Structure formats: structure tokens, C-alpha cells
Amino acid sequence: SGFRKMAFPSGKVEGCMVQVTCGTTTLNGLWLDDVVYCPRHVICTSEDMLNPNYEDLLIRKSNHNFLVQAGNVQLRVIGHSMQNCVLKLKVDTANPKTPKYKFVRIQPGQTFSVLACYNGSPSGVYQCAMRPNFTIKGSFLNGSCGSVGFNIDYDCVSFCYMHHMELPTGVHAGTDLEGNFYGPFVDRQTAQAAGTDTTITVNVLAWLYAAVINGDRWFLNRFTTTLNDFNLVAMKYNYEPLTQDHVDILGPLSAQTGIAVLDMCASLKELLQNGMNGRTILGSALLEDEFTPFDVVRQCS
Amino acid sequence: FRKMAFPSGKVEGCMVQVTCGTTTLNGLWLDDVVYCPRHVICTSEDMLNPNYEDLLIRKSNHNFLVQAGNVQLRVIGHSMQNCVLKLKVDTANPKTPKYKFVRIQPGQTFSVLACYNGSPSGVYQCAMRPNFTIKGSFLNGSCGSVGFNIDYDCVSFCYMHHMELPTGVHAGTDLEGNFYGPFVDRQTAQAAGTDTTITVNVLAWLYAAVINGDRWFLNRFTTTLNDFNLVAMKYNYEPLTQDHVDILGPLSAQTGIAVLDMCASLKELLQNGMNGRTILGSALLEDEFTPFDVVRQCS
Ligand SMILES: *[C@@H](O)[C@H](C[C@@H]1CCNC1=O)NC(=O)[C@H](CC(C)C)NC(=O)OCC(C)(C)[S@@](=O)c1ccccc1
């Protein structure tokens, strides 16, 4: 096809990874300025993980119960607090590798890079898309919690994900960096289930724009649609409805190709209703939904 | 199951920008030497048949502008090793990792740090194709981007980017400046030899699909090594060697599926197709995970 999942370079995030241990439970934390962020379930024994009372568990803890290490080197904890599902550990050293950063809460469909880490040590980097059911298809083993997802804009690292759990079907769930879960999940070792997933329409449209940019445009029809008519049809094919924000983020690709967003929607609608009829797009009979409009521009330009 | 790249930070701290005339690309700064593609020294009227030794002897140290961020590094010497230029600078890179230069075999995988103007832009996993191309994502200005693997603290550099072929695949050198494949650093349209599929890697990925509970493509049958290889060659798959079978041992043990059993399942896929089903999300048989890749990620 000429497209591939591409992560951002991970070095600026690698420089922020530490390990956090409480008892024998070690996970990863994110060290920015003089604060380390990590999943609050580090304070849980395996027994607590069944039905933890986090407020009560935290009361029993003191600064001297947290072992924070950058590599083998201990970072002294001088303060702690809980913000939703993340623990914030104030430390006595500002991280000299702290990048320009911010904390962002993403929407389904947005992609980000994951720096998978174990014992504070990066193992691999790969791109994930936040699914409409607020799960990601990660590659996470025991000890991966506290690994983060991020995007990089110029010099600024936008942190959008911190890893907390795996679901029965093998997909993954987590929080933003303010500790608010994506989706209806809770940090308890209880049976939970991912909602039925849907196709990320805005990313499929980005994919069709990519195909057009590359001269593959058999599927462009002469018709258009309203956003409401398109949304009602799309849901019948298990595609997500479009938001105004989706229409807006397709703006640049619409301008680059001269194909109005609602005209592309009518072309997609015909593909949904009539199928590919044996044809391919960018070399495939399957439509791709894990490239955002930004991902497309990045790899086409 | 995720195609996973190595963390790129150790390589990012080595990337610099190299400019000669109106040509800019990337260099790799290790200790006091910057490595980059030699075609940086070529002008327009040079690129079609460049007599590189002749063009290089006519250059001075000051013709090369090297920048690390906002800082210019003074070139105090230069030499050429095959298709790579080595620029000696007056400063050591303190971010130089432990490293080695390796020449990888077809079928082996590596991470690419794609860079533009000395700035890292993206990281992804690639495999050396049997025809010695790589299916990369590289645009104008990407030359000098490198491919690498990481072992403990040691970066093994295996690839430096030089060119795109008309089919959209890519070609480059090892860090001794020798091309992978029959390609030449001149501005001409070059075709590669017929590519084939990396069979040992397809098998590794089928084991990965089982390990993740996807086992619809399995069958009860078995095959001999030679009969499988006859079918593989027919379908433009690479031969499977006994070393490959042995390399696949751990994945075999993990799943309790003998290698030649999985070969029989792959034979069925080749002859019957996937029938619209998918494996690990893919409509196609994936051949850019090595056995090591699969094991390291499932461990
Ligand atoms: C880095 O300098 C650059 C990377 C290329 C640019 C686009 N994607 C890449 O991967 N390398 C080159 O531009 C390279 C330079 C020569 C080795 C001196 N040339 C190259 O890759 O040319 C691509 C062709 C497909 C050959 S295009 O230029 C062409 C040439 C002749 C006839 C048809 C098409």
C-alpha cells in the first residue's frame, strides 16, 4: 500500500521513564519535573486488587513506602497524592531530561505512540489507535503498567495514555495522565468486558483521501450527502457517526485533493452499500481505519 | 500482535544534518566521525554518472556544513569508504552509545529511524527483503537515516538509506558503505530482482497467531521438509532450511506444534488462500517478523 504504522521517536519519553515499587509490586512511572506519575494500583497487594479501597490503602502509606528508581538509582519521594486513578509522587530531584510537555485527553480514532516499558526500561515502540470502545490493541505483558502513549508536535510531547490493564479479549485499557480512564473501565481485578467495537469512519475517510493523493480514485462518485444522512447509513454498517470535529480534521486533506468531505462521504456510502465489487484501494480490498488524517499527511508529505 | 520497533533514543542522539552545496541529508555522529551517504557531494550534472573519487578529491573540509541542532561542527578531515563519506569533526559526541556495525542477512528485521534535516521524524520496523530491497517509508531528504537493532545497551547499525526505486521500495548500504543488492548510487531508475516471501518469518507469525488464540488455519496434516520446499519454491517462497526449523524450536515447544506440522498448514494456506478470513488482523501472510521478534514480544 505504501503506508505503514510509524511511531514517533521515543527518546524524549525514554528519558522520563522510571520504576515505582510498593512492596513487591513494581510498575513504571513517568518522571516530569519533580513529579513521578504512575498507576495507583501500585499500592495494592494481589488481595487488594480484587476489591481495593484506594483511599483507605493510601492512608496507610507514607512517602518512605515508595521506592522510585531511575535505573538502579533511587529517587527520594517527598510527597504523594492521588488524582483519580494515578498516583503523583513528589520527588526531590527535577528530571533534567524533562521535555516540553503537556497532558492531552484524546478521542477515539486518534493514534499515538506507545513506549512499552518493564522495570522502568523501554522495550519497544509502536503506534496504537484508540478504538471507539475506548480500548487499544497493545502488546503489553506483566509489568507493563505505567507505560505511556504520546504524540510529539515540534519539540513538545503530548502525553495521552498511561497503561493499566488487559481485558478478556486481549485488548488494553488505561487512563489519561490525570488518571481518568478512557471508557467505562475501573482499576479492579474484576471481570470487565470491551463494548462491541465499531469502525473509525474519520480514519477510513483519511485513507480514501490518501488513495486519491496516490492516484487511486475509481471510487469517487458524482454525488454528495448530508452529514446526518451519512451518519444514519454508516451506523447500519457498524461505522461510527462523524462529529463536526471529524469534518474539521479532514479539512486539510479535503483542501489538498479538492474533494469536499461530504462528497467523500457519499463515495464511502456507496462502497458500504455496494461493496468493492472485486476492486482494491491502495492495493487492498479492506479499508484501513487506524491512520488519522494527520498520519496520512505525515506519510504523504 | 504488534510490529514493534526498538526504542530509538540512543540513535536520535547521533543524528545530525550534513549539507554540501544545495544538497542536504542526514549523518550519523559517532565519537568524532560523521557518516553519511557520499552522494551528498553530487550536483545535478553529477548524479547520472558520478566519478566519486574524482568529485571528492576536489572538495575541501569547509565545503561540508554539519549541524547538530543549533551547533555547527567543524569538519577537520574526510575520507570515503565505498558509498559512505566519513567526516572527521573536532568534537566528540558524548551521546555516542555502545555500538557495532553489522551487515544483516535477508529475512532479518531492523528498526528504522527516519530523519529529515538531521531531525528524527518516525520509527518503524523493516526487513531486509530477499532481493535486498527494503519496504520503507522514506521521502526527499531521508538519506542518511539508519536502521538498527538493540541488544542490551549495544546498538548494531545495519542500514543507511540512499535511494528509492521506481516501484516504491528502497535501497541502501551497510555502515561500511556496501549496498545491499545490485544497486548503485547514481540517479537512474533501477529494478530489483524478483522478490520472494520470507518463509521462516511467515511460520514465526503463524505461531504468533496461535499463541494469541487464532488457530483456524491449522490442519491435522504434516509434511516433509523437501515436499514443503517444493511447494514453497513454486509459490515464490524462500527455502526453509534445517537451521530455520531449529530456530523455530522454541515457538514449536511453546505451542506443541511441530515445525513441519505448521509447514503443512502453511501449504494449505498457499494452495487454498484465506477464504476471506484474516490472521492477526491481516488479509495477507505477514513475513517481516523473525522468530526472535515473535519470542521477544511474547516474553
Ligand atoms: C536521499 O537523498 C534520497 C532519498 C529518496 C528520495 C525520495 N525517496 C527516497 O528514498 N535519495 C535520492 O534521491 C537518490 C539519490 C541518488 C542515489 C544519487 N535517488 C533516487 O532515489 O532516485 C529515485 C528514482 C526512482 C531513481 S527518481 O529520481 C527517477 C530517476 C530516473 C528515472 C526515473 C525516476
Curated annotation (Swiss-Prot), chain A:
Covered range of the whole protein: 3264 to 3564 of 7096
Cytoplasmic side: 1-301
Phenotype upon changing N142A: Does not affect ability to cleave and inactivate human TRMT1
Peptidase C30 domain mapped to chain residues: 1-301
Subcellular location: Host cytoplasm; Host Golgi apparatus; Host nucleus
UniProt catalytic activity: TSAVLQ-|-SGFRK-NH2 and SGVTFQ-|-GKFKK the two peptides corresponding to the two self-cleavage sites of the SARS 3C-like proteinase are the two most reactive peptide substrates. The enzyme exhibits a strong preference for substrates containing Gln at P1 position and Leu at P2 position
Cross-link (Glycyl lysine isopeptide (Lys-Gly) (interchain with G-Cter in ubiquitin)): K5, K90
Signal peptide: none
Name this protein carries in UniProt: 3C-like proteinase nsp5
UniProt effect for mutating P132H: In strain: Omicron/BA.1, Omicron/BA.2, Omicron/BA.2.12.1, Omicron/BA.2.75, Omicron/BA.4, Omicron/BA.5, Omicron/BQ.1.1, Omicron/XBB.1.5, Omicron/EG.5.1
Phenotypic consequence of M49A: Does not affect ability to cleave and inactivate human TRMT1
Regulation of protein activity: Inhibited by pyridone-containing alpha-ketoamides compounds 13a and 13b. In turn, alpha-ketoamide 13b (tert-butyl (1-((S)-1-(((S)-4-(benzylamino)-3,4-dioxo-1-((S)-2-oxopyrrolidin-3-yl)butan-2-yl)amino)-3-cyclopropyl-1-oxopropan-2-yl)-2-oxo-1,2-dihydropyridin-3-yl)carbamate) inhibits SARS-CoV-2 replication in human lung cells. Inhibited ex vivo by michael acceptor inhibitor N3. Inhibited ex vivo by compound 11a and 11b.
List of catalytic residues: H41, C145
Assembly with partners or alone: 3CL-PRO exists as monomer and homodimer. Only the homodimer shows catalytic activity. Interacts with host FBXO22; this interaction promotes the proteasomal degradation of nsp5.
Taxonomic placement: Viruses, Riboviria, Orthornavirae, Pisuviricota, Pisoniviricetes
Effect of K90R: In strain: Beta/B.1.351
Superkingdom: Viruses
Function: Cleaves the C-terminus of replicase polyprotein at 11 sites. Recognizes substrates containing the core sequence [ILMVF]-Q-|-[SGACN]. Cleaves and inactivates human TRMT1, preventing tRNA guanine(26)-dimethylation of tRNAs. May cleave human NLRP1 in lung epithelial cells, thereby activating the NLRP1 inflammasome pathway. May cleave human GSDMD, triggering alternative GSDME-mediated epithelial cell death upon activation of the NLRP1 inflammasome, which may enhance the release interleukins 1B, 6, 16 and 18. Also able to bind an ADP-ribose-1''-phosphate (ADRP).
